Amino acid sequence: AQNPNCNIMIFHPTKEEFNDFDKYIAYMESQGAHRAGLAKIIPPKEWKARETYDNISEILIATPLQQVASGRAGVFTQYHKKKKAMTVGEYRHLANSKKYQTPPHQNFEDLERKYWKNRIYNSPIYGADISGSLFDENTKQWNLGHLGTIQDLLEKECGVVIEGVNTPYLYFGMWKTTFAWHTEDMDLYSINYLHLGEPKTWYVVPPEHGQRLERLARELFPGSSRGCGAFLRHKVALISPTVLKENGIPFNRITQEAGEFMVTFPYGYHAGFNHGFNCAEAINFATPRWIDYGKMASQCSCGEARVTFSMDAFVRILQPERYDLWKRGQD
Ligand SMILES: O=C(O)CNC(=O)C(=O)O
Ligand SMILES: [Mg+2]
Ligand code: NI
Ligand SMILES: [Zn+2]
């Protein structure tokens, strides 16, 4: 068995190897990458996502989200308070202000210590989930707006034609902006490209150990657990590495820098934070190996998780028993 310790693997494809996206994902899995739940891909040195970022300041962040924490430093939830619209140029200037900027630090480790000590005492503003792309249309390799769609994968593997579309999303971050512990919708893959700015630190639990994280989360968030049988779908709960280690939960960590891709694999729980002003682009995707994970994915039916149009068909075809109840939550 390849990668039996479930370590995060780092790949350096050549420009030739960067042509065929599906084939490269399958290669990484042949080497055991998926067992970690997360992999890093460093693009060949010849590749670029676009020529420059000099002209992005006029993108609108229609609903910036203030991430307000409750709890203790290592075990907390966050709620998202909606703020007034602002441009990316306005948001960048806010990120760089004395109130929001990255503090002085020695290295990524010192920054990580400061994040876990102090996150709860501040409310950073995150421009998340903005439909759009920063890849140039002429970028032919690993262009996250030109991937094969999940609907087409389901049709190729299973023969059924379904409605829905699959487009990328932009994320504008600042110091302390946080992504809570989650797997993807329908336990899909994700791919995330850090276009510019400061790093993003990731934490991940191997897919084979995901249920250990869920059991800890039920213990740590006991009212949320009674409210919903899949409350991590709400994407609000944080648990620190120190708390995971105290409770014996297997995990790994890695920091993504600008110019690098990360892939999350089906049922790979992940969480993390941004170091400073940055912009990432991410999209969900599927492979043949995903189908069985999609059939078994948990679902929020309490109504809180409220998701995309295209998830309807996935539930309807892969999980017809749950359909009915899941759609009562969505309506
Ligand atoms: O970058 C972020 O805030 C969150 N991204 C992801 O969870 C992802 O790419 O799967
Ligand atoms: Mg612009
Ligand atoms: Ni994710
Ligand atoms: Zn729920």
Swiss-Prot record:
Catalytic activity from the UniProt record: N(6),N(6),N(6)-trimethyl-L-lysyl(9)-[histone H3] + 2 2-oxoglutarate + 2 O2 = N(6)-methyl-L-lysyl(9)-[histone H3] + 2 formaldehyde + 2 succinate + 2 CO2
GO CC terms: blood microparticle; chromatin; nucleoplasm; nucleus; pericentric heterochromatin; site of double-strand break
Range within the parent protein: 11 to 341 of 523
Residues modified as PolyADP-ribosyl glutamic acid: 16-17
Residues involved in Fe cation binding: 182, 184, 270
Location in or out of the cell: Nucleus
Family: Belongs to the JHDM3 histone demethylase family.
GO molecular-function term, one example from the UniProt record: chromatin DNA binding
Annotated 2-oxoglutarate binding sites: 126, 192, 200, 235
Name recorded for this polypeptide: Lysine-specific demethylase 4D
Keyword Nucleus: yes
Cofactor requirements of the protein: Fe(2+)
GO biological process: cellular response to ionizing radiation; chromatin remodeling; double-strand break repair via homologous recombination; inflammatory response; positive regulation of chromatin binding; positive regulation of double-strand break repair via nonhomologous end joining; regulation of gene expression; regulation of protein phosphorylation
Keywords for the protein's UniProt record, in alphabetical order: ADP-ribosylation, Chromatin regulator, Dioxygenase, Iron, Metal-binding, Nucleus, Oxidoreductase, Transcription, Transcription regulation, Ubl conjugation, Zinc
Binding residues annotated for Zn(2+), in chain numbering: 228, 234, 300, 302
Reported function: Histone demethylase that specifically demethylates 'Lys-9' of histone H3, thereby playing a central role in histone code. Does not demethylate histone H3 'Lys-4', H3 'Lys-27', H3 'Lys-36' nor H4 'Lys-20'. Demethylates both di- and trimethylated H3 'Lys-9' residue, while it has no activity on monomethylated residues. Demethylation of Lys residue generates formaldehyde and succinate.
Free-text description of this protein's post-translational modifications in UniProt: Ubiquitinated via 'Lys-63'-linked ubiquitin chains. Deubiquitinated by USP14 with the help of TRIM14 leading to stabilization.
UniProt enzyme class: oxidoreductase
Annotated ranges, domain JmjN: 8-50
Cofactor detail note: Binds 1 Fe(2+) ion per subunit.
Record flagged with keyword Zinc: yes
Protein's organism: Homo sapiens (Human)
Entry's EC annotation: 1.14.11.66
